[PDB]
Amino acid sequence: QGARQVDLIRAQLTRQLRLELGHESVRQARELVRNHVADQAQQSATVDRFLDQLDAMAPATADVDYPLLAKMRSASRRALTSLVDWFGTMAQDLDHQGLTTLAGELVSVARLLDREAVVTRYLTVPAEDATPRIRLIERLVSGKVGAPTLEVLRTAVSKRWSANSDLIDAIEHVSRQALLELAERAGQVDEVEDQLFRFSRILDVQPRLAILLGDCAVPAEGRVRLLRKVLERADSTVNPVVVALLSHTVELLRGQAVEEAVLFLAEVAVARRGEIVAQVGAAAELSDAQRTRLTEVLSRIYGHPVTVQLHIDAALLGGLSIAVGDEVIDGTLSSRLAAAEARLP
Amino acid sequence: DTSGRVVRVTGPVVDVEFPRGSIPELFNALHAEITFESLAKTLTLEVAQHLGDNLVRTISLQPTDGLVRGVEVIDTGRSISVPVGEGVKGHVFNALGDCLDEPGYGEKFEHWSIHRKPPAFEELEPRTEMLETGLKVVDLLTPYVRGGKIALFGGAGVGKTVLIQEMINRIARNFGGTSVFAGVGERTREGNDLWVELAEANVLKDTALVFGQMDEPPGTRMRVALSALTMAEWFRDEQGQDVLLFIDNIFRFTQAGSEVSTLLGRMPSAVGYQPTLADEMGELQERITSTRGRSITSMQAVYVPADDYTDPAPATTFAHLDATTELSRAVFSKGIFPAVDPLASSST
Amino acid sequence: DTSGRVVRVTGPVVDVEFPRGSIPELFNALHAEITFESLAKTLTLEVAQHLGDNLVRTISLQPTDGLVRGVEVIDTGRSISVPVGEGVKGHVFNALGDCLDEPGYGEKFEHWSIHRKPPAFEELEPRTEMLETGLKVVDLLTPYVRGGKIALFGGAGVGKTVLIQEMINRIARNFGGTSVFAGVGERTREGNDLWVELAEANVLKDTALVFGQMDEPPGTRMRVALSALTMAEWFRDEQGQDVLLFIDNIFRFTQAGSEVSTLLGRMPSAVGYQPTLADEMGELQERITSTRGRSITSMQAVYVPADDYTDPAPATTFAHLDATTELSRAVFSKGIFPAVDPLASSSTILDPSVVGDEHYRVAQEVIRILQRYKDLQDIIAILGIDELSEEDKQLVNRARRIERFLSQNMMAAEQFTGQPGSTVPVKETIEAFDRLCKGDFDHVPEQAFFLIGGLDDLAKKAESLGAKL
Amino acid sequence: RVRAEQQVASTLQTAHEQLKRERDAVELDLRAHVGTMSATLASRILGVDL
Amino acid sequence: TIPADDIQSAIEEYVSSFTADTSREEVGTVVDAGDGIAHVEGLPSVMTQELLEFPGGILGVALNLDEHSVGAVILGDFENIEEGQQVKRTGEVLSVPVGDGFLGRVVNPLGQPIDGRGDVDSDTRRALELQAPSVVHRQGVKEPLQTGIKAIDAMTPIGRGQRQLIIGDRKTGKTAVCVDTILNQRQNWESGDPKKQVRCVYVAIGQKGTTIAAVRRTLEEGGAMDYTTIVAAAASESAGFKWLAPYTGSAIAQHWMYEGKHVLIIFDDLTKQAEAYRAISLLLRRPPGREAYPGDVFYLHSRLLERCAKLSDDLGGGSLTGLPIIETKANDISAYIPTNVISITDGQCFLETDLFNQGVRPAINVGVSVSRVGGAAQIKAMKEVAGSLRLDLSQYRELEAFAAFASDLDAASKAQLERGARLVELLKQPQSQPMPVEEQVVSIFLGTGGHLDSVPVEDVRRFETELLDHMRASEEEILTEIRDSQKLTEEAADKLTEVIKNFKKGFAATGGGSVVP
Amino acid sequence: GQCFLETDLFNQGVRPAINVGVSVSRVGGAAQIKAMKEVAGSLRLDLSQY
């Protein structure tokens, strides 16, 4: 037994030495890769090396993802798809100022709904002979707003809803769809999408502005003042419809995370086209040729057209790390370093 | 197009969402699939509640280890059905009707739902009748009731299995009848033991064994008595035969019902049993009755918690028992078989 | 910036909101301010749960009276730390690590986090060395383990505090190492008593006291044991010399954890305790241990709620101890002190291979006699003693003399009986109880056995009543 | 028993010290290969000889 | 001597062969975390009971699944969980390494050695929740598993495939009974016969680490670690480890049972596993029932104990004998978890504090202790010498009220009283001293054969020991006949009786008188 | 401390109804004058034993 004990201590200190050997080994490899990849060309070499592995990544049984339609439990979904089909029928009616005033009045009546909860409860009964409800709503704004507005509100309240916040958010959603069509007519769809994404970047990376926009109880006039003001502080946001969207969204934040709400806005904007968002991270921005490579290989993977968002971070030490919805392909070399470190014997 | 999908998995409780016009009726049998090759199986779910918004809450009958949210759930359209007929004699089944000794046997029999109603008040016997077994101590001091329920209070080593085989023989040879054994919460060792003893004494050909074992979720332990009772009801009503139903530890049926009630979030009654304890005990014991000349006589092993005969479970059980047979060890040591205690046994 | 904001204040539990990414880890220490001039202070909050949506549920260590919603909460980036080193000896400290008798003392010491992991299993070693106290009943039936885990169980007000004071007098007065005393949710009068009495015996210069008492909110009563245990762990691991750790009513740790379990949003367990009862008790009690070559002789008092030894808190504490001295109120009501239940108390070194053959034989005979007496007591109460045998009457006389001879006049009970204390070596105890069980003193009255020391005291008090031996 | 105890305890102490001497004196000589093994690990992690 | 260049070469080969294919992983995000539970949004394809890996090598088990999040139990180092971390999907249910490399090791409830003696060579892996043997896969329990304790082996026999509950308050000798049962298999191990060798697994749930150290030391001093594994979930481990430790110990010992081997598994304080599972279920906010238990705790224990089976000869003939341990409080066997495990097992050994204090050790209550397998788990010799024991002890227990009026008793009554006193002195046994079956047969033959009526009741123990000692030195052939033939023939009975007579005329009592009739 | 009063001791004529066995004062002789500390030294224990 004493012999066994001495063998135990010998072998255990042996394993200890092995471990602190491997740790400094991975340290040395880490600084070696860090000073090697400092070559601006070698970062591109690594990423387009990973790109051929991506070329040998097919296939993937991807599914289309929806902005909030996949969030509502039931009864509200059917209602939401019915209303989006109704607005798809509406799609060509309104004109420029038509659509913009549609959005303004719809967000105003959303404020009106969230101002009187009891009337929302009443108009959100999931009953069959909903006709008194529709009377109610026109009784509210018979001479206050536009006619197709009142029509779509009628067909909305005609539907059944599992809750109250579902209809509240649905009218916001159809107003956003109207603004999306307005931006579409102008032909800036990818422009507005990527500018919302970039504003989401600058909103999340310095979340102070995000939180000071999340003030629930504070009135929203100063909120939108602050917001637009910070936006048109520079004119790299020449497009005004982005400002319209974000303003009439922050008007009814309802305690939502701004740093997530703006991503939600961008994602529904891209989802209008049927594309799937795909965030990516790397250490240095690549040429737009490599962007074409990435978009084509990701479309081949997920069987849908996709858009990217390159959030620069050098600490990833080259390579890419992509995330599509709720799965991740992590090829950046720093993740491999952490893996080989944690998987030491 | 008309199938559901798993939404929540909380142990044996599984919530399934169906389309707007395809909600399964209460107590329906649903089928889900666990494809993880190690635990690959077909889960049988029993609809327990309608939660609203097309959600139903079901109790799983197999362990849900390996179930994924979103898996398609198929609705069978009927409750748990067991195979019925003369061919179920001599075989071992589980609470769902699957043959354990010969997998696949019985799948092309007639299948009967385990949720049935007792005979109508028009059809019940208004006059009690004595079941003459042929045993001296029973026929004299503890006369059995035909179509009634007899409590059995024999432990280990007093010849309880011997008395069970004896009753099987007597009901098969003096009445031209049948026996069905429901092992509610059966120890698998004792289940296999009973199987091989019934096969050795050549009385298995007159018995149908239905085993809801202890290593199973509370659903099958709660429904195995109903499965065996459905087989017995087919033997009585359809074949025109006297039946003897041995329910081993009806207390385990009560306890499984209490566990199922706790899992479904229901507030407990006194002591801790389910709020619907007497209703479930009645729903089970009221189908064991005499009807149209034929009867189902039941012998039930009873457990009394803490020797407290006022405990809600034995107090609810004894509302239906017509006789009591206590197997004594002081009588078994004297060499007196059957070891029926003549002073502790009793009849109504 | 990267600070917090108080959102909810429900008693001692405070909810705080932080920006995304600046959420403090679990068990961190946050600082909030109470500016009301009559109650102005700096609240220390220990992060307990991550509520989601950047919310954080913390437990306050000071009373929250005067705390406003929306005030700034500063994340210190670390857990609660206490001063450690050979300089904490001789001073009364806080649950936060603040010196009470000399404020500011110890802010320049090394500071150790009060959250540790228990030693690895390969470092654990069983302890089987007897710690001779000097009490007859303890030395005989519940031999304490040197370097092991000892506890005193008992209801409310039986003997626990007096027994721990007695053991501080016996074991710690002539010790070659360090002593640490944790007053976990106890009286403050007793804390001042101990402070003064350790200053009198010149023991304070070797002892470090850490007090969080009954008037403190549940956070202090939940963390004071961890603070004192961190001081003891420093004395064991860094200095490495023979720590003594006394803890008064450690249970108060469990009770303080139970007072806030519903405010933290946990469903209650059987008897109203937290669902994490055994888990927290194990996380704490596994750090109180002696590793291989490094000794900590621990001694805790365990309150038994309503004298029910089946209560989940003592029933869970029972599994962490090498020796248990279990005090009864039935023995307290008879005037026998210390009120040790000889039939319930136990020790793991009560082994013929550890204490010897004669010690073990005498202890087993005493236990058998007392068990037979407890079995006969009801018959004697109803039918009378004259109904028994002659063997049984002999045994009953012996058992009454034995249960009176297990009592003793302790050194720490002079304040309650006016009588000075006694000390009895273990060999004298063994031989005395051997003579009792054999029947050498069956002619001495039942008194003259009551509250005395060895056999010389027995002879003195027997002759004081007109008898010999 | 005690004889089998004192002997094994003494040889345990003397072997522990000898293995400590082995350890400290062989600790740093193997670091001649830590550089090249770090290099080959970097080559594996990049997918190139660099 | 140390292989340092070998240590170079090991990590050398490791790093020269390192590879991590960038495969698509499914990740989720921690939303909340507290008290050892973490809720993880995302992970659509995660299955129930699946292992998840948090940042920092932390492990969890996905228990609760709903449309919002995934409630997972953290298996340790929980204070490192934060809101916002990412959780990776493993794709596996809880598995444990299994093989012969676990004999003599102390392991986690994950197969990780915590003794420090190096990694464990694992044959394969085995899932924790594999189904129990079918009702047609088993076989009648017929082979005895000798505990070496006279009271158990004679009154409540244990077979190979039986589940016997050791139930008692505390400090009554349950751990001692189970450790003696383990130590008694040392001679079975030294035989080298895989049909006689019993491999032991000891699961320590919720125990102080020093208690596990003491148990392992006791097993080592008896040479019992050559065939024993210790699965330890100490008192400081998470509720997850305390809940999973019996299933880890039972996943091991099924790899052996299905290989045609015989195993004995001890679950020290299944009550503590029940409290850990109750903590987990109350933190996951599942509906509580009696004593706040989740409602599937009877399932928790029956699923575990129904895997201790006696397989058929078509499956190899292996067996797993379960010894669960339950701590009652104030002898309340009518509590919830005692009721459950009494209902599940095949027999119960009730250890009592009153009996322990009376000097009856092991403190087994032979009146209420039962074994539903019975004489089917006894050799013919023990089966016939111990049949004359239960009735004698019952008659003694019903006559011991007249212990002081033997003058007024019939001659048969006083004879029964004295024989019962001698028999009660016969079933006592020291701790950590198990007896082989032939010595127990000889001792019970002394008791029931009337050969102790001449000995003072305060000497019986010694006499028994000494006689066995004599027979271990002079007449070994009697013990060899009983051991190899499993029965006591008439010739062996005559030889044993005359040996007893000679020893009696050579024996010296403590009262001074002779013990000759 | 505690001064536990009982209904049984009250009806028996013991008034005040203090249960001398379970009643106690944790300050003790420090809360008495010298004369009462000496004369009432072990009164509570004597009465419990009685």
Ligand SMILES: Nc1ncnc2c1ncn2[C@@H]1O[C@H](COP(=O)(O)OP(=O)(O)OP(=O)(O)O)[C@@H](O)[C@H]1O
């Ligand atoms: N057969 C025996 N003879 C004499 N003493 C015994 C015997 N069995 C056990 N003991 C003594 O009982 C003491 C405690 O027993 P043990 O620890 O085995 O009980 P337990 O069931 O494990 O209780 P717990 O789990 O609460 O500690 C030990 O110190 C041991 O010396």
Ligand SMILES: Nc1ncnc2c1ncn2[C@@H]1O[C@H](COP(=O)(O)OP(=O)(O)O)[C@@H](O)[C@H]1O
């Ligand atoms: N050895 C003793 N001699 C006399 N009185 C005692 C003794 N031990 C305890 N007591 C009495 O018990 C009372 C409280 O005991 P204490 O141990 O302080 O309670 P607790 O165990 O609840 O802390 C004391 O006031 C004292 O009068």
Ligand SMILES: [Mg+2]
């Ligand atoms: Mg006290």
Ligand SMILES: [Mg+2]
């Ligand atoms: Mg134990």
